[PDB]
């Protein structure tokens, strides 16, 4: 747990990675606001099931009380979906690869009221990842950091020790990649500051989803209803 070396931490996280799921996209018809929201939330719901089982494989997570596990996932779930989306989309400039059969650009986002603004933020983050040449090993570290950090000051030491271990692991990755000592702390900071942006996007996305619910645009699963409710 705290016992893991950096290479063991990276291997654990890479092994734990969820699959890339497909959407239910129906190319026989045009989108409507309702059908696009239906597709995205259907996808989110199925990803959430994999996310729950992924979280249990993140070092230290299953040691927490069930209540604290619930709290961390309730807090981080949309951040985690979004950083996954941005990662998937890196090699597709101008597009969001929600699924291999659902690759959307900002003009398609305009199909849902209030969505293009969120698409634009997600695309910008993908660009940022691209420009930084974010590595897969760095990505899985960041995603685990989001899970453990986002809800931690709604409540401790144990989580903080695992978070420190992931920091050690990021630095180790950068060192192994040949970055200078100064480059290591500069890149660590650049990566962690993007988590501010991912939080921002999640908060905007949560408000958007709530609006969609509250306008009866789409039926939400019990899981999404309760995730959304936590906020």
């Amino acid at each position: 747990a705290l016992s893991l070396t950096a290479d063991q931490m990276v291997s654990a996280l890479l092994d734990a990675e969820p699959p890339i799921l497909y959407s239910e996209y129906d190319p026989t018809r045009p989108f409507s606001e309702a059908s696009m929201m239906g597709l995205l939330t259907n996808l989110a719901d199925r990803e959430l099931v994999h996310m729950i089982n992924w979280a249990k494989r993140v070092p230290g997570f299953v040691d927490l009380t069930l209540h604290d596990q619930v709290h961390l996932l309730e807090c981080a779930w949309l951040e985690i979906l979004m950083i996954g989306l941005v990662w998937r989309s890196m090699e597709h400039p101008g597009k969001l690869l929600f699924a291999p059969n659902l690759l959307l650009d900002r003009n398609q986002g305009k199909c849902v009221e209030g969505m293009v603004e969120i698409f634009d933020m997600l695309l910008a983050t993908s660009s940022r990842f691209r420009m930084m040449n974010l590595q897969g090993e760095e990505f899985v570290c960041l995603k685990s950091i989001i899970l453990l950090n986002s809800g931690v000051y709604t409540f401790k030491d144990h989580i903080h020790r695992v978070l420190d271990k992931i920091t050690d692991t990021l630095i180790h990755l950068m060192a192994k990649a040949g970055l200078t000592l100064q480059q290591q702390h500069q890149r660590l900071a650049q990566l962690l500051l993007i988590l501010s942006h991912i939080r921002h996007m999640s908060n905007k996305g949560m408000e958007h989803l709530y609006s969609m619910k509250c306008k009866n645009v789409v039926p939400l699963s019990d899981l999404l209803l309760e995730m959304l409710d936590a906020h």
Binding site: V49, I52, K56, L66, H67, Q69, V70, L73, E74, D222, L223, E226, M227
Partner: peptide, 11 residues
């Protein structure tokens, strides 16, 4: 309990 609380226990 929340749905998630149960779902978290399925091994």
């Amino acid at each position: 309990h929340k749905l998630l609380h149960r779902l978290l226990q399925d091994s």
